[PDB]
């Protein structure tokens, strides 16, 4: 059943050079729109990084969350990698090709898991669709104009590999986005159930709060991530909006707030009308 669509708009700030490769004139190119030649952040590199951070978060808290989320009682912390048997006792239970991901095996279990209820599950005779839509982040109008003014939007950085004894240098190049860029993101949560959506928003903000202290794509451990979420507005888009079309959606106002001044700083305050209309 459909009740509305909580819509999350804002900006992604690449505080440090962000690299999301393609492997196809720089030797390691970041991906680009083929018609403009501008870089972008996909919706699939953003979502699998919000999920990979959140699955390790749940993996540490399997025992402490057995009675808020069921079907975390059927998982043991760890991977099923050594014993090559899927949907076993351990957590990261589905092998895709060579990688192990937590994907719950049935609809009846993915409605209880906090990962798969928010991010989706494949299953056999299951097909649990996700509840969030993560759009491709494109450069802000202010940064498309710097592309018009003749600037460089993607630098090229040279590293080197050096022997520990004889200091033989062995360099390579990596294209990465110029630090400081502003993207425009969009996440549209789908209010299916009217009870557990607060736990699905507060888990999505936790995945973003871990992303501001981890990296987004690329090399990262050598300092190629360092992302920052700059929220603009949260909107509700009620069920009455879609039938009659009149513009009475509920709009939160957060021009300059963080991902941690938004999770509990104003959570009782910013969602006051949304939690009232349900």
Partner 1 sequence: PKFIAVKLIPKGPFRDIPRADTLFGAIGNAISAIHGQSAVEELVDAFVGGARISSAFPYSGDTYYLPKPLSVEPALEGILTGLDEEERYTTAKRLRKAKYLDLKNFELALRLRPFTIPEEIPYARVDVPRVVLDRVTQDSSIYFWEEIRFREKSGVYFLYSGPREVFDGYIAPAMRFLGDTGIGGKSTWGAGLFEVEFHEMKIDAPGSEYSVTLSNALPTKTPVLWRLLRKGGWSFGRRKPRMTFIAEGSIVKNDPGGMERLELGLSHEVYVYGLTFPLGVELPEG
Partner 2 sequence: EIDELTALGGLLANIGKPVQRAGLYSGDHSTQGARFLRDLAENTGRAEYELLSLFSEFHHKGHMKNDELMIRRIKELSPERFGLTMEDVLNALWIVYEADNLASGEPQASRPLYSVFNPGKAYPWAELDFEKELPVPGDVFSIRSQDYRELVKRLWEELSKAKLRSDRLLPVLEKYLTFVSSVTSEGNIISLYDHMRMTSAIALAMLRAGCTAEDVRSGRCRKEKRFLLIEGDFSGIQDFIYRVSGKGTLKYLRARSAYLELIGWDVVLEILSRLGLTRANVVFNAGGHFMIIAQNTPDAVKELEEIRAKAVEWLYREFESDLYLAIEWEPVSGREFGREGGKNLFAEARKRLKHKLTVRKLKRFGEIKGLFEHGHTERLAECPVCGRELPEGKLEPSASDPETKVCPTCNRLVSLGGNLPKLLGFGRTAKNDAGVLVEGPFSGFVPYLQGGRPVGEQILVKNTLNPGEIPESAQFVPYFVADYFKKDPKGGVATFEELSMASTGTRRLGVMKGDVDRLGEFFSSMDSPSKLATASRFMDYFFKGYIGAIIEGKFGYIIGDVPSLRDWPEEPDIVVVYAGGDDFFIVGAWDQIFELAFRVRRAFNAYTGGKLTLSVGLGYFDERTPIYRMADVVSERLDTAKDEGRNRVFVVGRSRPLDGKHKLSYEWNHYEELWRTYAPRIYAGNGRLKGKLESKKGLLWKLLEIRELYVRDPNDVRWAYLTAYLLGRHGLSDLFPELVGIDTKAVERKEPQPVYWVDGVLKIVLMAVRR
Residues placed in the known binding site for Zn(2+): 102, 104, 113, 116
The answer to the question of residue 121 lying near partner 1 (CB under 8 A) is no
The answer to the question of residue 111 lying near Zn ion (CB under 5 A) is no
- C-beta atoms surrounding 88 within 10 Å: 15
Q: Which does 56 bind (CB under 5 to 8 A by kind): Zn ion, partner 2, partner 1, none?
A: partner 1
* Among positions 27, 73, 162, 253, the unique one binding partner 2 when judged by CB under 8 A: 27
* Among positions 50, 116, 177, 211, the unique one binding Zn ion when judged by CB under 5 A: 116
Contact 35, 138 (CB under 8 A): no
Count of residues making up the chain:
278
Q: What span, in angstroms and rounded, lies between the C-alpha atoms of 71 and 267?
A: 27
Q: What span, in angstroms and rounded, lies between the C-alpha atoms of 88 and 103?
A: 12
- C-beta atoms surrounding 2 within 10 Å: 9
The answer to the question of residue 43 lying near partner 1 (CB under 8 A) is yes
Q: Which does 116 bind (CB under 5 to 8 A by kind): partner 2, partner 1, Zn ion, none?
A: Zn ion
Q: What is the DSSP string of 174-233?
A: EEEEPTT-EEEEEEEEEE-SSSTTHHHHHHHHHHHHHHTTS--SSS-TTS---EEEEEEE
* Among positions 74, 76, 87, 130, the unique one binding partner 1 when judged by CB under 8 A: 130
Write each residue from 105 to 144 as x if it is in contact with partner 2 (CB under 8 A), else as -, in one continuous string.
----------------------------------------
Write each residue from 87 to 116 as x if it is in contact with partner 1 (CB under 8 A), else as -, in one continuous string.
-----x---xxxxxxx--------------
Q: At 121, phi and psi to the nearest 5?
A: -150, 150
The answer to the question of residue 120 lying near partner 1 (CB under 8 A) is yes
Q: Which does 73 bind (CB under 5 to 8 A by kind): partner 1, Zn ion, partner 2, none?
A: none
- Using the minimum distance from each CB to partner 1, give the nearer residue, 14 or 134: 134
Q: Are strands 76-79 and 90-92 parallel, antiparallel or unpaired?
A: parallel
The answer to the question of residue 82 lying near partner 1 (CB under 8 A) is no
Contact 5, 237 (CB under 8 A): yes
Question: For binding to partner 2 (CB under 8 A), which residues are involved?
Answer: 25-27, 173
């Amino acid at each position: 059943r459909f009740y509305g669509k909580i819509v999350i708009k804002g900006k992604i700030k690449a505080v440090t050079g962000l690299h999301i490769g393609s492997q196809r004139g720089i030797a390691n190119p970041v991906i680009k729109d083929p018609h403009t030649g501008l870089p972008y952040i996909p919706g699939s590199s953003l979502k699998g990084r919000l999920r990979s951070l959140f699955e390790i978060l749940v993996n540490s808290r399997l025992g402490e969350w057995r009675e808020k989320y069921p079907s975390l009682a059927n998982y043991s912390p760890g991977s099923c990698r050594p014993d090559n048997q899927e949907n076993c006792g351990k957590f990261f239970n589905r092998k895709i090709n060579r990688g192990w991901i937590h994907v719950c095996p049935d609809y009846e279990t993915a409605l209880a898991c906090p990962v798969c209820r928010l991010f989706g599950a494949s299953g056999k005779e299951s097909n649990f669709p996700s509840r969030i839509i993560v759009r491709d982040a494109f450069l802000t109008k202010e940064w498309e104009e710097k592309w018009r003014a003749g600037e460089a939007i993607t630098e090229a950085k040279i590293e080197v590999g050096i022997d520990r004894v004889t200091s033989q240098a062995n360099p390579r190049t990596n294209e990465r986005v110029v630090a400081g860029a502003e993207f425009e993101f969009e996440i549209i949560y789908n209010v299916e159930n009217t009870t557990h959506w607060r736990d699905d928003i507060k888990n999505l903000l936790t995945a973003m709060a871990l992303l501001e202290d981890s990296y987004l794509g690329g090399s990262g451990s050598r300092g190629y991530g360092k992302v920052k979420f700059i929220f603009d507005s949260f909107e509700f888009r009620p069920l009455d909006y879609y039938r009659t079309g009149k513009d009475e959606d509920i709009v939160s106002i957060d021009a300059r707030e963080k991902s941690v001044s938004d999770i509990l700083s104003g959570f009782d305050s910013l969602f006051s009308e949304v939690e009232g209309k349900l």
